Design a protein around this nucleic acid. Structure first.
Lengths: 98, 121, 117
DNA sequence: GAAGCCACATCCTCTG
DNA sequence: CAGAGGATGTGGCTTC
């Protein structure tokens, strides 16, 4: 699917979870699908570095993520300062039929 | 004027009407964003009320229908199991699978009302 | 506002522009005119007709006839027509019996409103 | 290759 | 102030 060829967020974001060397900016939070946000504006910065979008900030990247809600890609951990989680039971209906 | 003077002529001349004079492919258009189960109930309960929303898939032409002047000859669920049997552009004119919510239908010129309506002028 | 013909010469409606974006605040809201004296209160719905996705998704699709002029707070076209293809949108007037005016080549509904390419 | 998609970009807004 | 969200331009990418 065009997640292969052209770079996504969720496809890109999880270059940084699984990689131990980027825990400087994020981490898996626990057994269940969850993730922390170390530097909220160094995160956005590299997403700018990739997207070739130097203007980028959190407010910008963030909005894009808040779309994901209605589509059932990921969801928010309510009240937690910058912690959402991935819905994979849906990523496979979003990457394969039934 | 509710109708056109040459009410018969338009039906038997307009590409629009003759394209719908033959038995065409129709389908239920109501509540497209709803599960197949809900759409089945809504369509049936509505048919019983004497109304629905069917559209000739092929041509694109949608319609909101009213089976009236509850009825008998306008909405019959007995003629066959698992299915059920206005003034369009100033022309007086007159089945869907209860599971698939699709089937076949067409238009037929209403000579009766075409006279009644034409007489109101 | 400006009007255009119909397939029923008893009713007329707005000049819905050539090509627009999927679900936008229309550039001119939808007026629908009753030349034949209609009881100001009668309902008017529209259904987007096209060989492809025969019933598109619409929003504020129902409106009330008032002063012989039914207006749609803000109609919005969601279900796309497709490439080159427009909607022959149907127009219902809830009376006894109800009446419809078909309207071919109404508007082209894509994801982009026509940007300078 | 414009013509339809696409998945963010950039924006200014509320409202907890 | 974060966080959900409408609106609307943007750029890369399949489809006619």
């Amino acid at each position: 699917m065009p997640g292969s060829g052209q770079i996504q967020l969720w496809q890109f974001l999880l270059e940084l979870l699984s990689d131990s060397s980027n825990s400087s900016c994020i981490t898996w939070e626990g057994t269940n699908g969850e993730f922390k946000m170390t530097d909220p504006d160094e995160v956005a910065r590299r997403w700018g570095e990739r997207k070739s979008k130097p203007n980028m900030n959190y407010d910008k990247l963030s909005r894009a993520l808040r779309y994901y809600y209605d589509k059932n890609i990921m969801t928010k951990v309510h009240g937690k300062r910058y912690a959402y989680k991935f819905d994979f039971h849906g990523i496979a209906q979003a990457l394969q039929p039934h | 004027p509710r109708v056109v003077p040459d009410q018969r002529s338009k039906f038997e001349n307009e590409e629009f009407f003759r394209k719908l004079s033959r038995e065409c492919e129709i389908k239920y258009t109501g509540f497209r964003d709803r599960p197949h189960e809900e759409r089945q109930a809504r369509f049936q309960n509505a048919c019983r009320d004497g109304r629905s929303e069917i559209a000739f898939v092929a041509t694109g032409t949608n319609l909101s229908l009213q089976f009236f002047p509850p009825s008998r000859e306008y909405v019959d669920l007995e003629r066959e199991a698992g299915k059920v049997y206005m003034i369009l552009n100033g022309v007086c004119v007159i089945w869907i699978d209860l599971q698939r919510l699709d089937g076949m239908g067409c238009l037929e010129f209403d000579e009766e009302r075409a006279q009644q309506e034409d007489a109101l002028a | 506002a400006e009007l255009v013909r119909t397939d029923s010469p008893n009713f007329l409606c707005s000049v819905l522009p050539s090509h627009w974006r999927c679900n936008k605040t229309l550039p001119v809201a939808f007026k629908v005119v009753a030349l034949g004296e209609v009881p100001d209160g009668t309902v008017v719905t529209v259904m987007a007709g096209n060989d492809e996705n025969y019933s598109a998704e619409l929003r504020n699709a129902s409106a009330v006839m008032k002063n012989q002029v039914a207006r749609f707070n803000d109609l919005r076209f969601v279900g796309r027509s497709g490439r080159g293809k427009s909607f022959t949108l149907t127009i219902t007037v809830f009376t006894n019996p109800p009446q419809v005016a078909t309207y071919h080549r109404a508007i082209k509904v894509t994801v982009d409103g026509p940007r300078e390419p």
